[PDB]
Structure formats: C-alpha cells, structure tokens
Amino acid sequence: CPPRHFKVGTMSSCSPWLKCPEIRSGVRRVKLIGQGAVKKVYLSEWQGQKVALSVLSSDQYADDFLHGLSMLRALQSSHVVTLVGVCEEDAVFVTEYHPLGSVLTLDTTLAQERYRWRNSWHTRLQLAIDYVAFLAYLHSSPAGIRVMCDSNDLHKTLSQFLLASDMRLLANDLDALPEVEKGGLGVKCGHHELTGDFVAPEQLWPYGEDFSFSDEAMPGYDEKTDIWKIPDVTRFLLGDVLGGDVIHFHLFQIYSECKRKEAHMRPTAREVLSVYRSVYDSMMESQSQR
Ligand SMILES: CC(=O)N[C@H]1[C@H](O[C@H]2[C@H](O)[C@@H](CO)O[C@@H](O[C@H]3[C@H](O)[C@H](O)[C@@H](Oc4ccc5c(C)cc(=O)oc5c4)O[C@@H]3CO)[C@@H]2NC(C)=O)O[C@H](CO)[C@H](O)[C@@H]1O
Ligand SMILES: Nc1ncnc2c1ncn2[C@@H]1O[C@H](COP(=O)(O)OP(=O)(O)O)[C@@H](O)[C@H]1O
Ligand SMILES: [Mg+2]
Numbered sequence: 692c693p694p695r696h697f698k699v700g701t702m703s704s705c706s707p708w709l710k711c712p713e714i715r716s717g718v719r720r721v722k723l724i725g726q727g728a729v730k731k732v733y734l735s736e737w738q739g740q741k742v743a744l745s746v747l748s749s750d751q752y753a754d755d756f757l758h759g760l761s762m763l764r765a766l767q768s769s770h771v772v773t774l775v776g777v778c779e780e781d782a783v784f785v786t787e788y789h790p791l792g793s794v795l796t797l798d799t800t801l802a803q804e805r806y807r808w809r810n811s812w813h814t815r816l817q818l819a820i821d822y823v824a825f826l827a828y829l830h831s832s833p834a835g836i837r838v839m840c841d842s843n844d845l846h847k848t849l850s851q852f853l854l855a856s857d858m859r860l861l862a863n864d865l866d867a868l869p870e871v872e873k874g875g876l877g878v879k880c881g882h883h884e885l886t887g888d889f890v891a892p893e894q895l896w897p898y899g900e901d902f903s904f905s906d907e908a909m910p911g912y913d914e915k916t917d918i919w920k921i922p923d924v925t926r927f928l929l930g931d932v933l934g935g936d937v938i939h940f941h942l943f944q945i946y947s948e949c950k951r952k953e954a955h956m957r958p959t960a961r962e963v964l965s966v967y968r969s970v971y972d973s974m975m976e977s978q979s980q981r
C-alpha cells in the first residue's frame with residue numbers, strides 16, 4: 692500500500708487511514724481480546740472486516756497512550772503492526788487484527804497441529820530474526836535511536852509482540868520508546884527501581900543498601916539494554932525444536948557478547964541480526980543436500 696493506506700483481511704484494495712469521524716461510526720466494538728495498564732484492545736468489525744481497536748484504559752496513563760500512538764505512526768514498517776486508523780482526540784486508534792494474539796502464546800499456537808508443520812526451526816529462528824530485525828530498525832529508526840523499555844521480565848517482553856497468521860513477529864506496544872541522543876546521559880525505563888537479571892545490569896540501582904533508590908540519582912543507559920535481553924528472548928522463541936540444539940551452539944559466542952556486563956562491548960542489533968541470518972542460511976544449505 693501507499694504510505695498511509697491499509698489493506699487488511701479480505702480487502703481487494705488499499706484504503707487511507709480512517710480518521711475520527713468514520714471510527715466513531717464505522718467501527719463497532721465486539722470482544723475484548725487484551726487488557727493492560729495502558730490499553731484495552733477489542734476485536735472489532737469495520738465493513739465486514741475484523742480489526743483491532745485500542746482504547747485508553749485509565750486516564751491516568753493518557754500520555755503513554757498518545758506517545759505510543761505517536762511512535763506507532765512514526766515507525767510503520769515491516770517490523771511493526773499495520774495501522775488502520777488514528778483518532779488521538781478520543782485517545783483511540785485502530786490496527787490490523789492478528790487472531791493468533793501475542794507471541795507470548797507461541798507454544799500454544801504451535802501446539803495446534805494446524806500449525807504443527809510450522810513447529811520447525813526455520814519458523815522459530817525466523818521469528819527471532821524478525822525480533823532482532825525489529826530491534827535493528829528500532830535503534831536506527833527515523834525517530835532516532837529508540838529503546839524498547841517495557842521489557843523487565845520475559846513474559847511482559849513477549850506481550851508487546853504479535854504473531855501474524857503466517858508466523859511473522861510484529862511489534863505493537865510502543866508506549867515506552869525513549870530516544871537515546873548522541874549527546875550523552877542516556878535514558879531510563881520508568882521512574883521506579885528495576886530489579887532482576889533479565890534487565891541489563893546498568894538498569895539497576897548501583898549504590899547498594901546504604902543509599903536508597905532515587906529517580907534523579909539513577910544515571911541512565913542506552914539501547915544496549917535491548918541487546919542484553921536478546922538471548923533470553925531467542926531462547927524462548929526457539930524453545931526445544933528439532934535442530935535448535937545446533938542453532939544455540941552457533942549462537943553461543945554472540946549470546947555471550949549480548950550478556951557482557953559492560954554495555955559498550957555488546958554487539959549492535961545489526962551485528963546480532965547478521966549472524967542470525969547467516970546461521971539461518973547455513974542450516975538451510977545443510978538441510979538442502981540431505
Ligand atoms: C506511567 C509511567 O511511568 N510511564 C513511563 C514509562 O514507563 C514504563 C516503563 O518504561 C516500564 C519499566 O519497564 O514499565 C511500564 O509499566 C509496566 C510494568 O513494568 C509491568 O510490565 C506491568 O505493570 C502493571 C501495572 C498495572 C497493571 C494494571 C492494573 C492492569 C493490567 O492489566 O496490567 C498492569 C500491569 O505493565 C506495565 C505497562 O505495560 C512503564 N509504563 C507504565 C504505563 O507504567 O517509560 C516512558 C519512557 O520510557 C516514560 O517514563 C513514562 O513516563
Ligand atoms: N492487533 C492486535 N491483534 C490481536 N491481538 C492484539 C492486538 N493488539 C493487542 N493484542 C493484544 O492486546 C494485548 C495488550 O496490548 P498492548 O499494546 O501491549 O496493551 P498495553 O499497552 O496496555 O500493555 C497484547 O499483548 C495482545 O494479547
Ligand atoms: Mg503491553
């Protein structure tokens with residue numbers, strides 16, 4: 692489609708984005724398909740087409756919603772969910788409906804043996820490629836370097852991605868996308884203290900027991916925090932599929948670079964993605980001659 696047109700479902704042609712008037716009328720609410728702190732998502736109908744309708748849950752988080760919509764329009768690409776309509780005045784927008792839900796429910800989807808054949812390594816590794824391909828485009832976005840902040844644990848990280856009906860990974864929940872400027876200082880992912888090993892080590896309070904947490908005193912980090920969580924996401928996406936034991940071997944060294952304690956030594960998302968594509972191709976040639 693042209694830049695701001697869309698063709699979803701059984702559409703024969705692309706339509707320009709729906710604006711506030713047609714959304715209030717032509718978009719009818721059906722079934723809630725997703726909750727969240729920032730949003731409520733309803734499966735909906737617009738002109739015989741199934742669609743996704745995201746509303747602002749609580750007025751408390753109006754700013755997060757509007758910027759997530761601001762970034763959603765800014766980063767419409769092959770790596771992000773397809774936008775359908777925008778009406779920020781009503782704090783609401785419309786995107787393409789993906790019936791497989793989030794990639795959080797991946798193993799349940801591949802359990803359905805209408806999707807058993809796709810429970811292969813070339814599908815799961817492609818999803819990981821799409822994941823790193825998104826992160827590569829994120830850190831080099833037209834809106835400057837951006838950081839996927841809403842990713843403190845593994846499951847919340849997966850909840851921000853969708854599974855298109857052809858086993859492709861798409862980003863969706865872009866409410867928290869700060870920009871890393873080339874000036875310095877960096878960014879922070881929230882106004883409260885983060886903990887755990889799933890977040891990057893620089894995302895932790897570095898002062899210990901004597902100094903209690905304080906938002907102004909947190910130094911600040913960059914996009915390498917996304918590199919940090921790539922193996923844990925990659926480990927989930929491959930699961931234990933036939934062949935993934937060989938793939939993790941090939942990716943061990945690039946796994947070990949993403950998990951470096953010093954962030955400036957971690958590989959860029961384009962460095963990670965290139966290894967992922969080359970391993971995919973190598974095992975595609977290894978399978979061919981058998
Ligand atoms: C309100 C605010 O602080 N927005 C800033 C924003 O913050 C993000 C933050 O970047 C990340 C920290 O990782 O976390 C966001 O909140 C998460 C939270 O981490 C958990 O995953 C989870 O928490 C809840 C809490 C309540 C509910 C409710 C009742 C209902 C429900 O169904 O789910 C939850 C889950 O989910 C939230 C959101 O996904 C935090 N965002 C929010 C809305 O709190 O970061 C940007 C730039 O990064 C600015 O700092 C914002 O000001
Ligand atoms: N287009 C969509 N198609 C199908 N499922 C969706 C779509 N958008 C959201 N979902 C579901 O809504 C959930 C919450 O979406 P999200 O953007 O992350 O809300 P929030 O910002 O409140 O956390 C997703 O994890 C997912 O299950
Ligand atoms: Mg979410």
Ligand SMILES: [Mg+2]
Pocket residue numbers: 727729730841864865866867
């Ligand atoms: Mg959100």
